[PDB]
Amino acid sequence: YQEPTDPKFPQQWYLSGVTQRDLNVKAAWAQGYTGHGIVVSILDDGIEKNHPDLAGNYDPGASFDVNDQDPDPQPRYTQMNDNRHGTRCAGEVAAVANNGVCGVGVAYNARIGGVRMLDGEVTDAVEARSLGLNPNHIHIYSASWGPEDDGKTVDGPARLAEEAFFRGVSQGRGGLGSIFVWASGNGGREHDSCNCDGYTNSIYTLSISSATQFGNVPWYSEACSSTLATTYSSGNQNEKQIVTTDLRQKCTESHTGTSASAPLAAGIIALTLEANKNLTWRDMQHLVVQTSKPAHLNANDWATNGVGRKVSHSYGYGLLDAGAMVALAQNWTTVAPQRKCIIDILTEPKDIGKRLEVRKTVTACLGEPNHITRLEHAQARLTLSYNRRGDLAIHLVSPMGTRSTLLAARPHDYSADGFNDWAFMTTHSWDEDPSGEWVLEIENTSEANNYGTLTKFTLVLYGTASGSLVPR
Ligand SMILES: Clc1cc(Cl)cc(-c2cc(CN3CCN(c4ccncc4)CC3)cc(CN3CCN(c4ccncc4)CC3)c2)c1
Ligand SMILES: *[C@@H]1O[C@H](CO)[C@@H](O)[C@H](O)[C@H]1NC(C)=O
Ligand SMILES: [Ca+2]
Ligand SMILES: [Ca+2]
Ligand SMILES: [Ca+2]
Ligand SMILES: [Cl-]
Ligand code: NA
Ligand code: NA
Ligand code: NA
Ligand code: NA
């Protein structure tokens, strides 16, 4: 195997590193996997389809302009180069290799398109037409953005976009399911908590956070239990950043944020899908859980879950490992059909006050076709009133003892509107047996005399009843 000769490939430290602080992508390339036959689409502000490092891989069938309602996602050029982000993300996935231009994509033989959707009013319909673009041609969708990362917003897909997610994972990709890769958010300096973003908090999105070059949680990162894994991105001014294609046929070394991590994950997923085209949308999440690596990622919340895997709310299961992903994909056995066990917990409304604990012992649909002994995602769907939402912190403890933070205190969130059946999701109990006692904790983290009521707590368990590995 000959590594790429592109002039900035040596600067792509998160791929070309020889110091074990990288995504282990050369190992996948050397196994023969470069993304051939895989189609990825960037949902963003457009794609410079004539970029010298993108044109060779550009796919019109992976592209559309839902802002202006035409097939051509070319960005709108402005003096400030506002609409450059989709071009940066496209190159992360699939910049051409060995062509003397810039660097390379993770999946440098994949086909790449873009949906121009963010350069205009983003409506539910715009979102749905983007998520649902050509779902039997595009394999993988990469989305780096969502509701405002101001640390006070609670919002998610409205009806058309949610329908697009379910149609995507159910009938997309020949029934194997569209793979939606999502950035978990850039709201760290606002103390944002990313389960409040219903796109990344979805089970249907494979959510990705960031690590800095020296292995730290970047200033912009949001912690939450819905995140699955991590890719490198930017940090402080002594740490390197992401090197990729830029608007106006240029090359940037200063692409940043969690919004730069999701495209790198999308490229690794493209390599993995080349290694096994029969993987389902859930298979792909299982592979990420099993192969991602905590080592050398610094956080104070690494915890071992019930099946022996380390998990963090900043990093999920750790750094994506492309070589391990493609290796495990090759002989992967398709997971069993997804079961869903619905457990309505409360028999009466519960005053929250300063602190509320709700304990319930469940059988996880014992005796029924939705019996789950092997958890995937779990949700605590909560309906509650509170006078100042951001003073709440919420935790969910599984029978195996795994404490998931569902909501951290958000100091800017002054809302008096509470949560209306909000489906806080955790990935941290993946592969655990969910039978037993679950504990929900709701706490007022402020000294104020805050008040409210929990009126509904639905525990929703997803998973299967077969195929478990010996704990790690
Ligand atoms: Cl599918 C998909 C893929 C992607 Cl990548 C994003 C969304 C995404 C975007 C936004 C729009 N932002 C402004 C434009 N951005 C830029 C970021 C960086 N630089 C420049 C612009 C991104 C963030 C918002 C919502 C939330 N969404 C909720 C449902 N909707 C409404 C609900 C109620 N009332 C009005 C509208 C529409 C808005 C999602 C959805
Ligand atoms: C894909 O997986 C399904 C489910 O296990 C199986 O029935 C089918 O034969 C597989 N197809 C290929 C081409 O491997
Ligand atoms: Ca256009
Ligand atoms: Ca190149
Ligand atoms: Ca956020
Ligand atoms: Cl469902
Ligand atoms: Na965001
Ligand atoms: Na997700
Ligand atoms: Na534990
Ligand atoms: Na149990």
From Swiss-Prot:
Top-level taxon of origin: Eukaryota
Top EC class for this record: hydrolase
Positions with a binding annotation for Ca(2+) 1: D6, D53, V96, N99, V101, G103
Ranges for domain Peptidase S8: 12-326
Disulfide bonds: C102-C251, C194-C224, C341-C365
Compartment(s): Golgi apparatus, trans-Golgi network membrane; Cell membrane; Secreted; Endosome membrane
Binding site for substrate: 45, 82-83, 127, 144-149, 155, 183-186, 197, 199, 259
Region (Disordered): 53-74
pH dependence as annotated: Optimum pH is 6.0.
Positions of the catalytic residues: D44, H85, S259
Keyword Repressor: no
Family: Belongs to the peptidase S8 family. Furin subfamily.
Cited function: Ubiquitous endoprotease within constitutive secretory pathways capable of cleavage at the RX(K/R)R consensus motif. Mediates processing of TGFB1, an essential step in TGF-beta-1 activation. Converts through proteolytic cleavage the non-functional Brain natriuretic factor prohormone into its active hormone BNP(1-32). By mediating processing of accessory subunit ATP6AP1/Ac45 of the V-ATPase, regulates the acidification of dense-core secretory granules in islets of Langerhans cells.
Domain notes: Contains a cytoplasmic domain responsible for its TGN localization and recycling from the cell surface.
Listed name of the protein: Furin
Native organism: Homo sapiens
Protein encoded by which gene: FURIN
